[PDB]
Ligand binder design. Structure first.
Ligand SMILES: OC[C@@H]1[C@@H](O)[C@H](O)[C@H](O)c2nccn21
Ligand SMILES: [Ca+2]
Ligand SMILES: [Ca+2]
Ligand code: NA
Length: 434
């Protein structure tokens, strides 16, 4: 019997609503639910929650037509969410989760307050960029005082702002946000090696690399996405060029086959020598990026490596050794990157193969991560049953349930031709209001 995709979408929505109910019951206004114990935890600042999962969920709720739930969350934000807080926040996470989550909710709803709050937060984060003579953000900033800490940063944490900041520039009319984000990316791109790679670790004050390791995953992932995404969102010609150049350098110097499968281990950014044997599950986003930038055959080949892991292990291991294709770790983070790739590749040609693969992933999530009050990360994927930890990461609310729903629902609330997703799956273009 052919899969009824619409029924599967309805199941995703049902499960999401059920999870939301658990969040409301156990963790209202708190950063994350621990759905086994039925408790909450903080994410950014211990004891000073910022409604993380609520904010992350908003655009997902809207897309699913969970309008009452969406509005309850928006109304909570409008009444309660403030960033005048004497505590340190990680700049990267704060941007991709809270600035981006408020922006997608703003674009869905039109509510000016959500933009006001996104912009307030971005202005607090801007102090981290201003504290570097290179415009490379420090990793942490005090939201109230602007004090910075930890300049030993990385490509992802200096280069995952341009989508949110660029949308802020579009909406506000102030180019400063776009410029600040682009300047940081240009810094490292200008320091590419002769073979076109960047090391993944960089110092905000010296502006120099602090390792020799080029990476597509750990320390770097979304830098490469945001180059393409800035072309797509803003028509930025430099970013279009850079996106393709960076990917072609990776395909030339980091693509390696082991036991017939494509992997992208870390390499020395100048010599191209392999410097590591680990690949993170997190790398799976890159299969989708490869398609986006016009390297779809390679993207499908890379997806196939992860499809192998899913078929073999059920849940994709958090990290594997590329030389053996086996797990390096037994726990998971309830990770979304496989359906991320499936959606991104499916948006190119609408091949139902990607739906089939994502349906496996969704069903496996249901079979392994369901707990009393929501969905949880795993302790051990090698036991049967797989043992659970007790945490629903904030990104679950923005990412995989949205990916599944977008893959299966064909919702009229999204213009699929105009759809743009941040690295946290915040929708930054493509809402079709009712
Ligand atoms: O696993 C999802 C999380 C999210 O915060 C987001 O997708 C982000 O791009 C990322 N990089 C590595 C891990 N993650
Ligand atoms: Ca991502
Ligand atoms: Ca992407
Ligand atoms: Na979101």
């Amino acid at each position: 019997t052919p899969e009824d995709w619409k029924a599967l979408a309805a199941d995703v929505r049902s499960e999401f609503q059920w999870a939301w109910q658990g969040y409301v019951a156990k963790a209202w206004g708190k950063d994350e639910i621990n759905p086994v114990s039925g408790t909450s935890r903080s994410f950014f600042i211990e004891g000073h929650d910022l409604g993380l999962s609520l904010v992350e969920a908003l655009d997902t709720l809207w897309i699913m037509g969970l309008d009452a739930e969406f509005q309850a969350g928006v109304d909570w934000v409008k009444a309660n969410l403030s960033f005048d807080v004497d505590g340190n926040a990680q700049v990267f996470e704060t941007n991709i989760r809270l600035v981006g989550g408020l922006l997608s909710a703003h674009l869905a709803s039109g509510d000016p307050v959500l933009l006001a709050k996104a912009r307030d937060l971005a202005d607090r984060l801007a102090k981290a960029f201003e504290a570097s003579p290179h415009g490379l953000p420090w990793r942490y900033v005090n939201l109230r005082t602007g004090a910075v800490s930890d300049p030993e940063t990385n490509l992802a944490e200096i280069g995952t702002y341009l989508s949110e900041f660029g949308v802020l520039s579009q909406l506000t009319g102030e180019r400063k946000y776009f410029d600040m984000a682009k300047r940081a990316m240009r810094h490292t791109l200008d320091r590419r090696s002769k073979i076109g790679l960047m090391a993944a670790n960089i110092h905000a004050m010296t502006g120099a690399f602090t390792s020799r390791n080029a990476s597509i995953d750990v320390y770097a992932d979304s830098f490469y996405e945001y180059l393409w995404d800035a072309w797509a969102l803003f028509g930025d010609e430099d970013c279009k060029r850079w996106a393709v150049e960076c990917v072609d350098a990776q395909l030339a110097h980091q693509a390696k086959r082991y036991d017939g499968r494509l992997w992208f281990p870390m390499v020395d950014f100048e010599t191209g020598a392999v410097t590591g044997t680990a690949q993170s599950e997190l790398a799976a986003y890159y299969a989708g990026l490869l398609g986006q930038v016009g390297r779809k055959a390679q993207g499908d080949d890379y997806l196939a490596s992860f499809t192998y892991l899913q078929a073999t292990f059920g849940v994709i291991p958090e990290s594997i050794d590329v030389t053996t294709g086996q797990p390096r770790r037994k726990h998971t983070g309830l990770r979304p990157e496989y359906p991320d790739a499936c959606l991104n590749l499916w948006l190119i040609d609408r091949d139902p193969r990607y739906r089939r693969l994502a349906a496996i992933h969704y069903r496996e999530m249901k079979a392994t991560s369901r707990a009393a009050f929501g969905y949880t990360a795993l302790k051990d994927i090698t036991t049967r049953p797989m043992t659970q930890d007790d945490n629903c990461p904030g990104y679950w609310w923005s990412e995989q349930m949205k990916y599944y729903y977008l893959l299966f629902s064909d919702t009229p609330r999204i213009d699929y031709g105009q759809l743009q997703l941040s690295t946290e799956a915040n929708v930054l273009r493509g809402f079709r209001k009712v």
